[PDB]
Amino acid sequence: TMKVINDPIHGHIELHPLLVRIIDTPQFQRLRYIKQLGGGYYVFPGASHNRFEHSLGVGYLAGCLVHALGEKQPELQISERDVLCVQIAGLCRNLGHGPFSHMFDGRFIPLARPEVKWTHEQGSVMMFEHLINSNGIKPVMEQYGLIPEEDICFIKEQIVGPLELWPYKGRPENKSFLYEIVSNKRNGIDVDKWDYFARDCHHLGIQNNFDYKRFIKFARVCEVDNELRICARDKEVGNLYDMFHTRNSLHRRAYQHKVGNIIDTMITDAFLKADDYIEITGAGGKKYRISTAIDDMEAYTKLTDNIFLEILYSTDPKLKDAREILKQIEYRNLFKYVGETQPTGQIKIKREDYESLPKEVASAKPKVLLDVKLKAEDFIVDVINMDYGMQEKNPIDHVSFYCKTAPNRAIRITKNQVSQLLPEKFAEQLIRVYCKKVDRKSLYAARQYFVQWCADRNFTKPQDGDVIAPLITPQKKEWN
Amino acid sequence: DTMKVINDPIHGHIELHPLLVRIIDTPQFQRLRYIKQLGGGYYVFPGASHNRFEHSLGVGYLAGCLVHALGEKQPELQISERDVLCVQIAGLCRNLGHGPFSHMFDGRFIPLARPEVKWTHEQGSVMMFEHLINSNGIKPVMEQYGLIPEEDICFIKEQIVGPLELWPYKGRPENKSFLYEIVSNKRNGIDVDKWDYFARDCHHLGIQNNFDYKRFIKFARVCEVDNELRICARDKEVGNLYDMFHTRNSLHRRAYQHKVGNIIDTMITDAFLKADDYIEITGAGGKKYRISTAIDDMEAYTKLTDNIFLEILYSTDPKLKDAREILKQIEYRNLFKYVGETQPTGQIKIKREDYESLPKEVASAKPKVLLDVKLKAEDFIVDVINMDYGMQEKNPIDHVSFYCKTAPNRAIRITKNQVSQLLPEKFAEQLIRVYCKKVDRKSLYAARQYFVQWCADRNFTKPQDGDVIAPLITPQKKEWN
Amino acid sequence: DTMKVINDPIHGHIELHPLLVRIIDTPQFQRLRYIKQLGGGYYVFPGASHNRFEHSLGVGYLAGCLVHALGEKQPELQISERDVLCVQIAGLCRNLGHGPFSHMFDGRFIPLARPEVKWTHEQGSVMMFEHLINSNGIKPVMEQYGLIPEEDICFIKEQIVGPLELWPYKGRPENKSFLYEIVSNKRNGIDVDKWDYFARDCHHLGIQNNFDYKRFIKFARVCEVDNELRICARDKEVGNLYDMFHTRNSLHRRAYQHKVGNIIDTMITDAFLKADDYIEITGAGGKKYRISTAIDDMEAYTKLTDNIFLEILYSTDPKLKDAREILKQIEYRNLFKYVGETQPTGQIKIKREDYESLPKEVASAKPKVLLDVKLKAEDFIVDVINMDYGMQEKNPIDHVSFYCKTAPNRAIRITKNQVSQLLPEKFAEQLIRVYCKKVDRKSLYAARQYFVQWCADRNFTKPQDGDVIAPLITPQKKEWN
Amino acid sequence: DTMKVINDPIHGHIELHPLLVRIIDTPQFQRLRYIKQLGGGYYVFPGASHNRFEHSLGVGYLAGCLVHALGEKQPELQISERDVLCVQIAGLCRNLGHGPFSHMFDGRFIPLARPEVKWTHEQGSVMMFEHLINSNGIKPVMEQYGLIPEEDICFIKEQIVGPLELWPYKGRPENKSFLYEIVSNKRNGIDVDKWDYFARDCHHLGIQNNFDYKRFIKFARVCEVDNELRICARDKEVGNLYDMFHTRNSLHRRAYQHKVGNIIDTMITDAFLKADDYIEITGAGGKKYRISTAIDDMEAYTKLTDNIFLEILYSTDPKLKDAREILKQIEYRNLFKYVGETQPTGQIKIKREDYESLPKEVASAKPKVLLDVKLKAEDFIVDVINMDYGMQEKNPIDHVSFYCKTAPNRAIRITKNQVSQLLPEKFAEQLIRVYCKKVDRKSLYAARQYFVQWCADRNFTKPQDGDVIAPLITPQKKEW
Numbered sequence A: 001t002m003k004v005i006n007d008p009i010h011g012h013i014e015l016h017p018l019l020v021r022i023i024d025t026p027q028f029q030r031l032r033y034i035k036q037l038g039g040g041y042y043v044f045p046g047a048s049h050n051r052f053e054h055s056l057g058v059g060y061l062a063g064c065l066v067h068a069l070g071e072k073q074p075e076l077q078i079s080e081r082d083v084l085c086v087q088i089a090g091l092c093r094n095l096g097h098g099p100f101s102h103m104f105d106g107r108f109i110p111l112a113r114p115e116v117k118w119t120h121e122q123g124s125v126m127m128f129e130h131l132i133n134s135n136g137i138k139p140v141m142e143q144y145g146l147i148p149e150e151d152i153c154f155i156k157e158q159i160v161g162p163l164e165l166w167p168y169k170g171r172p173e174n175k176s177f178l179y180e181i182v183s184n185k186r187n188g189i190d191v192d193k194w195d196y197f198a199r200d201c202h203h204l205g206i207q208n209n210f211d212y213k214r215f216i217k218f219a220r221v222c223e224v225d226n227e228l229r230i231c232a233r234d235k236e237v238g239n240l241y242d243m244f245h246t247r248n249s250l251h252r253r254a255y256q257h258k259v260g261n262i263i264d265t266m267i268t269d270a271f272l273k274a275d276d277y278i279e280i281t282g283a284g285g286k287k288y289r290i291s292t293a294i295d296d297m298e299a300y301t302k303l304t305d306n307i308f309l310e311i312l313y314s315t316d317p318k319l320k321d322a323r324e325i326l327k328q329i330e331y332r333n334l335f336k337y338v339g340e341t342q343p344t345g346q347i348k349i350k351r352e353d354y355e356s357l358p359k360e361v362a363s364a365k366p367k368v369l370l371d372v373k374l375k376a377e378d379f380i381v382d383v384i385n386m387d388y389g390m391q392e393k394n395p396i397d398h399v400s401f402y403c404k405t406a407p408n409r410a411i412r413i414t415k416n417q418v419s420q421l422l423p424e425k426f427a428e429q430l431i432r433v434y435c436k437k438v439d440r441k442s443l444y445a446a447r448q449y450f451v452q453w454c455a456d457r458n459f460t461k462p463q464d465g466d467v468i469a470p471l472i473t474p475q476k477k478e479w480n
Numbered sequence B, C: 001d002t003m004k005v006i007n008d009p010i011h012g013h014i015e016l017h018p019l020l021v022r023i024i025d026t027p028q029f030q031r032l033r034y035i036k037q038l039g040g041g042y043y044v045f046p047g048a049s050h051n052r053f054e055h056s057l058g059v060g061y062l063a064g065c066l067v068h069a070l071g072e073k074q075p076e077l078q079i080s081e082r083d084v085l086c087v088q089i090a091g092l093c094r095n096l097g098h099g100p101f102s103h104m105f106d107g108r109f110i111p112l113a114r115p116e117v118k119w120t121h122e123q124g125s126v127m128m129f130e131h132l133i134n135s136n137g138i139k140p141v142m143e144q145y146g147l148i149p150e151e152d153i154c155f156i157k158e159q160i161v162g163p164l165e166l167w168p169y170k171g172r173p174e175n176k177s178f179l180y181e182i183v184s185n186k187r188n189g190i191d192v193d194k195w196d197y198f199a200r201d202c203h204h205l206g207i208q209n210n211f212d213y214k215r216f217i218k219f220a221r222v223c224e225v226d227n228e229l230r231i232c233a234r235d236k237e238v239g240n241l242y243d244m245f246h247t248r249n250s251l252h253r254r255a256y257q258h259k260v261g262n263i264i265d266t267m268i269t270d271a272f273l274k275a276d277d278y279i280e281i282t283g284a285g286g287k288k289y290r291i292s293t294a295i296d297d298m299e300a301y302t303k304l305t306d307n308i309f310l311e312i313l314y315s316t317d318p319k320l321k322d323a324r325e326i327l328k329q330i331e332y333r334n335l336f337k338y339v340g341e342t343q344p345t346g347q348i349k350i351k352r353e354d355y356e357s358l359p360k361e362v363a364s365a366k367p368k369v370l371l372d373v374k375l376k377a378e379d380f381i382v383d384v385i386n387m388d389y390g391m392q393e394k395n396p397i398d399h400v401s402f403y404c405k406t407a408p409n410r411a412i413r414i415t416k417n418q419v420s421q422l423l424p425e426k427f428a429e430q431l432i433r434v435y436c437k438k439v440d441r442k443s444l445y446a447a448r449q450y451f452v453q454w455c456a457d458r459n460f461t462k463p464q465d466g467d468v469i470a471p472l473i474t475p476q477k478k479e480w481n
Numbered sequence D: 001d002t003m004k005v006i007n008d009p010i011h012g013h014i015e016l017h018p019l020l021v022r023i024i025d026t027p028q029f030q031r032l033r034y035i036k037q038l039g040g041g042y043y044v045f046p047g048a049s050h051n052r053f054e055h056s057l058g059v060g061y062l063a064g065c066l067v068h069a070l071g072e073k074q075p076e077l078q079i080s081e082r083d084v085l086c087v088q089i090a091g092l093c094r095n096l097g098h099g100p101f102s103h104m105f106d107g108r109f110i111p112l113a114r115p116e117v118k119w120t121h122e123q124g125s126v127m128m129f130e131h132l133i134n135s136n137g138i139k140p141v142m143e144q145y146g147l148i149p150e151e152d153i154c155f156i157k158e159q160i161v162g163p164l165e166l167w168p169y170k171g172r173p174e175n176k177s178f179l180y181e182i183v184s185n186k187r188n189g190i191d192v193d194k195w196d197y198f199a200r201d202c203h204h205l206g207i208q209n210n211f212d213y214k215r216f217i218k219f220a221r222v223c224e225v226d227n228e229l230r231i232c233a234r235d236k237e238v239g240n241l242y243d244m245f246h247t248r249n250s251l252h253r254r255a256y257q258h259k260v261g262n263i264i265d266t267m268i269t270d271a272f273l274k275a276d277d278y279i280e281i282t283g284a285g286g287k288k289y290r291i292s293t294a295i296d297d298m299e300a301y302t303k304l305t306d307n308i309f310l311e312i313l314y315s316t317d318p319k320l321k322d323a324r325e326i327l328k329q330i331e332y333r334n335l336f337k338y339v340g341e342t343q344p345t346g347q348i349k350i351k352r353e354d355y356e357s358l359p360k361e362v363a364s365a366k367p368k369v370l371l372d373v374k375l376k377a378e379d380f381i382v383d384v385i386n387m388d389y390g391m392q393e394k395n396p397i398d399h400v401s402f403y404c405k406t407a408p409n410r411a412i413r414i415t416k417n418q419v420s421q422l423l424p425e426k427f428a429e430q431l432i433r434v435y436c437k438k439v440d441r442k443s444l445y446a447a448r449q450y451f452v453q454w455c456a457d458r459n460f461t462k463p464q465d466g467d468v469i470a471p472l473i474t475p476q477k478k479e480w
């Protein structure tokens, strides 16, 4: 029968036996050894938390919302079967994450396997399939009134979207709102965010501005374009803008911390240098690399943060280079942050250009006296796309509301109906430059290149420009 | 006398110097125990029972924290215990001038009861401070602890209200310019008063505070700027500061300007107006004052608190029947009814002198809709709310100085474009709320029609629920749909 | 009417059924906004601004949570919405009877002002409930929502006060026995009222609460015990229950019985006694009552709140000079002075009838020490405080039923010896505090000598600072050293 | 180098002196990032992801707070920056010696793997400290900041472990006696280590901490006691101290000794024992050690962390099949089954030498009941847990000195009878938990009968569920 778990974020959470069964598998328990925030623990020591607990919380919130909708509106005809499918999807959407979470799919795979297109979402689905099959979960699903054919499909669609008009098969348009819960492809407002806001804040020691419980109390389902969608009370629109403001602020302060990112980068580099020599045993004894473990779920199951220590503790001279990089992390001899800047006006930077940017910085020729001359390979340039989840688009334009005088009647609210104190744009890029040569003279030089390059490209003046490169900044009129 | 410890839920165990205790244990200060921080907000947010008293302790303590932190980081500043105590006293004493229900008193009631006079709680804080000192022989005690009342009383007053009339301050020289930035920062609004109320109001409202003042105190340094010594913030903390103001604005949107909170303020104000002629408060020499004239005698002002509300509610005098009746409608929750919200468009701005005429404009609107009842100007209330980042149209971060880690003594400026594109383009706006004093279904239905029609007439923004409440009006306007 | 949401800092967003709202929006309920939960504690713990009103919402909500949880876990209980609403109304309404400064009123002032009468805030809660219903036509609304006023009003009153006179309850049958355990558990004191105040008082005092009521609700089941259906707790949660009472006792030790908190209560009480003859409160039909007689007319009681304190403080009537003077000494913090604390020894226990004679005993002690001043009985205050786990000498866990996971429908009992040896051997005790009304150094020096001598004479426990305050006295007693 | 700021969720922004940073940025310290504070507790309390690393920062910081506060209140103490840094370093470094899964290592695994040796994490903290200093050239840096390595290294070690053998300390004189009370108080256990873990563990477990260390720091003074200068507490704070220990005991009851938490510790231990012969860790000079012998070489110990658990779990070596199999049963949550709890009666106490024989006693019990299966000693596990207030049968408040406001410089003593009758009469006890390795319904049914019978045979306390679990057995005993 049902279990109770004490979670510091949510208190006592009840788990249905079916969910317990899913949880007590190697594929799920693997998430215990994967840090939610990856390299962020190396900056924010409270951030020891792993994907496992986050996943329970997501499962629980998914349950809270679907339950609340069913209580408020019986006409929806939400079944226990629906509830469990939504919960399982909530529990299982993080299944696909790799070592150090976003470091894996954000940095390492793109560089190690550039041709392949891969996301932790893709992986969550494959791992789910693997989990089910390796553990005879299908019978248990039937025992609790689930129909594996339909429901497994439903659960996967919740995580990844349509597997291919109504494009979903797992449930009909009348249950369209169930898709908005775990992973909302329309506007990003889902229970996953709500868990991580609260859980990350509790651990980082930052405080969360967003009340998900309030939002759940005001959520209704209404008809919109012959779909039944989740609608929010009109007056809660400010709170939603704040939700995304909060999300952006958490990225600025924590998830994109300049040092957090460089640590991610260093770990990535070490993984690249270990990739040829590290072997992980997949299906039938067969052997995979860190970069190919994504092709066999049996191998992927064993790919966790542990890899980092396997490398750190290795004695194989093949891994000397990789191991050396991790040692510099332990001694805190890190690549050195040089500065930050942004593009100007319409200028935007594409992914294909990323590899050429170190070369551009090294090519800048500042009119200054330098001991050392620096090369492209000495520079790291991290480009960070900050948005409200939908590139240039405003996600509140993709949200439906209702008012208290007509609760069944969905409506739209424009930005101009809310406030003038809101953002005019919803996307931007940050450029961080770091130097792999750490000494005073290399660093002094690196700053001159950097600031010169900013001036050459008509980027924004680094905040400390006048202090670090006083001989460069005067040339640019706009800057002073 | 030696030092006392107080347990505050926001700040933990706070130490108080005997001098501060002496100031605190006076009728003038203890009066703050009977003045709600958020006034009518308690009638919407039941956790908001807190009073100005505790807020004032917290402000005093944070003032102390920041000045102490600057002195520890930089001895060369030559900050004395005398400076520390003066800053703390100013922190404790900047809320001394508040009246019943806080901002309701100076924001609503006085402007309507004594329209000719110009008055602010800041003014009052200074007069009440003067009164407190004199009525309790505090000056001797100040001397006993190494303060110089001539200079220091001036300093403390300037901290609260600004110059009492280059360098316009007398209480301290330009080398101690940064001490003025602490309790009430007239330059950019970044001060310890905000920090206390953010944390304290959030803890009570059950909303969560986004702003880390402790972090800010760790990164604060003093640097030279324009031959002044000013408090400077680490460059990379600039985002946090934008967030501080974003937080402040969000607290106003959710709580301090809650539509119902405001109407309750308004109703209490109305009741006070109707009681003003009959309520008498004994000031200096047995002389008698009204609620609206108590501000002229600090002895009378000392006795003017939230208690007035219950004095009226519990009165039996038939003179007060009308005032008393209004408070009773509050208890029964028969409140004036919110009709809707809208904003001006483009450059349009609304001045204070026009406020009285707006109910008349709404009543004059003639919507092409079937109405049982016809409504009059006096049936409508129109609240106009100026929301900003503390400096009207100005960006306060343009008035902040920073430093970088490579040159910690060298002050610098950071522009908005150097921070983010996701920041606001404007830093002030107005909200218009309309409420109706006639509560029945038909009067309310009607009121919505006038309101939306009037929005259309004035080219204001489409109320969010416009199409639902006034479906026959909204189509006429192209822009709206 | 449809349902309302209220944001509480302790519990978050609480939903209120329209019927509850209607009850809430009355003068009789709204009155609780002007009664401090902790009375004079605010004068020691400045975060404790909270009033009975918000506590009452929280109790109402928790009552709802538990009854809902039982119904979800066991449908066979047949719990109806009707039952749910009755339990919630009882939760909301059990604090209705509290007077100014809460426990100060029924604990101190009434006993001394009307010694013949027997009165408790529970009594008052019932009378005020009756009054609230009748004065506001609530009965019709109850019927509209499917309640049966005859049965249900009785049920609600029984929840608050117990049987109005076996199955001694009329409002519901033995099969719904467990509904009585929720709001005010007369059997063992484990109820949702405690759970609210633990969390709410901690949040405000700035002390941290050790007890997880949410956990307890998850584990709670109903089982048959002695042909009753009672709420049962999971066996392994027994430690948590012992901790619940430990926490309750610690909150009293640190806060509710703070020595200075208590003396302030005492000073306010004294001021009320001296004002009682001159303060008049208009009850039913214009008839006039005193502070001490307002309890006889609910219409008058409705207007009796903390406001009285300020009515006196701000009075000009020379009749009230003495009462007013006492409150002024509170504002200036010239308080009666704590002398010390001690406890009885062995079997010795002190009865209420002896309380009046104790100041006289202390004044009669004759310490072999040199004294400037000689002190009188009237100079001494002696507060006696009974600390227990809610059931005098009895252990409340002996009155709790449990279940185990292998047989969830089978109730069982757990003895102390089955839990831990580290638990208390006794569950009740008395503290004696002595204070002096003469505050000067020499009177205080003397008062300490009397006090410690008296402790020695009566074979009480050695005050913790006995050797330091009165070195010349403590040597005489062998046991002490 | 200048000072760093770290954001800790428990304590906020903590400042670190450059010297402490230097100590922290070493492999020997960074190792603590891969050792769970609560070991197997994370497998019961999913918020408890935290590691020894962050606990250590918090201890270091609180040590600093207290010593600073004493110096501010009393200059006459003559506390120097040198003293402050030494106390902080001791605070940071007292957890250095902990092994995989913390107390599981020294509480369970070593005692069973190397029974002849006597070893504690305290011993290890000292050896690891020595190793850390030497391997990283910290001594020069100590001198640079005004420390005297000869005296101060000794001082720091004495803080952690006590005298290395009248005044028995060499690192500082009797006039600075109170500095020893801070990091690890051998007199009464009131130290900053507790204060950190109370607050940190509670934050993570989702239990709430009853004890206000900040308050205690405000009221702490130094007074003369028996020609020593000792830390004294304000008289009226005595209740808070009793509550401190009550809180400590309640944390053990709820969390640190959770029945399932403990069985998981036991299972991990068992797996480590079965792996001990085959796992090799490279120590000094390429030399090879076992899990159980790594404690003899700090270079090897540095590499011994929670990672071992995954090294075994992911192993393919058939030598480790048995060890690996145990960890897999943990992942599937096929755990040994808790049977019940009981305590000894009266004066009866159980010694460590008898522990091995208890499974045999339970198996020897012969209940008058019908059984399908007969169970053996090896099928039973018996955990014995000694609960106290930190000083066996002794009351630690009897070893605390107080002062009063009237005479602040005058130390005094307070007896229990001067405080309350509602306090405990005893300050120590034992708990016995019995578990069964055979998990099926019939084995478990049987195990309960043995257990309860055995309790009756030994005149132990009646298990709380005795009547439900073993109704036939329970009636024979009159007392029950």
Ligand SMILES: Nc1ncnc2c1ncn2[C@H]1C[C@H](O)[C@@H](COP(=O)(O)OP(=O)(O)OP(=O)(O)O)O1
Pocket: A004, A005, A006, A007, C212, C215, C240, C405, D044, D045, D046, D206, D207, D254, D255, D260
């Ligand atoms: N006293 C407590 N207070 C708070 N949390 C607790 C307490 N005891 C245990 N927990 C946590 C640890 C677990 O995450 C969760 C459930 O544990 P627990 O109730 O002990 O379940 P269990 O599975 O060990 O017992 P059983 O299987 O006998 O029902 O609650």
Ligand SMILES: Nc1ncnc2c1ncn2[C@H]1C[C@H](O)[C@@H](COP(=O)(O)OP(=O)(O)OP(=O)(O)O)O1
Pocket: B005, B006, B007, B008, C044, C045, C046, C206, C207, C253, C254, C255, C260, D212, D215, D240, D405
């Ligand atoms: N046990 C406690 N835990 C937490 N806070 C407390 C406790 N006792 C008192 N406080 C709070 C209440 C007050 O705001 C503040 C000062 O209390 P306290 O130290 O009792 O001052 P006091 O003036 O009564 O004692 P004294 O004057 O004897 O030193 O600390």
Ligand SMILES: Nc1ncnc2c1ncn2[C@H]1C[C@H](O)[C@@H](COP(=O)(O)OP(=O)(O)OP(=O)(O)O)O1
Pocket: A211, A214, A239, A404, B044, B045, B046, B206, B207, B254, B260, C005, C006, C007, C008
């Ligand atoms: N944005 C917010 N965040 C948190 N709490 C809020 C917010 N807005 C209001 N509250 C609080 C104040 C109240 O205690 C409770 C209900 O308020 P609110 O949702 O504003 O109801 P309302 O009665 O004013 O609106 P309506 O009657 O139009 O639904 O929530």
Ligand SMILES: Nc1ncnc2c1ncn2[C@H]1C[C@H](O)[C@@H](COP(=O)(O)OP(=O)(O)OP(=O)(O)O)O1
Pocket: A043, A044, A045, A205, A206, A253, A254, A257, A259, B212, B215, B240, B405, D005, D006, D007, D008
């Ligand atoms: N905005 C923030 N709010 C709260 N904590 C933060 C914030 N940004 C960073 N932190 C945390 C992460 C670290 O634990 C700690 C210090 O980080 P930070 O001040 O960025 O130092 P840094 O070393 O990266 O910058 P620098 O070396 O330039 O001073 O505070």
Ligand SMILES: [Mg+2]
Pocket: A183, A192
């Ligand atoms: Mg997502």
Ligand SMILES: [Mg+2]
Pocket: none
């Ligand atoms: Mg005192």
Ligand SMILES: [Mg+2]
Pocket: none
């Ligand atoms: Mg201001």
Ligand SMILES: [Mg+2]
Pocket: C184, C185, C189, C193
């Ligand atoms: Mg009770």
Ligand SMILES: [Mg+2]
Pocket: none
């Ligand atoms: Mg740095």
Ligand SMILES: [Mg+2]
Pocket: D184, D185, D189
């Ligand atoms: Mg210890």
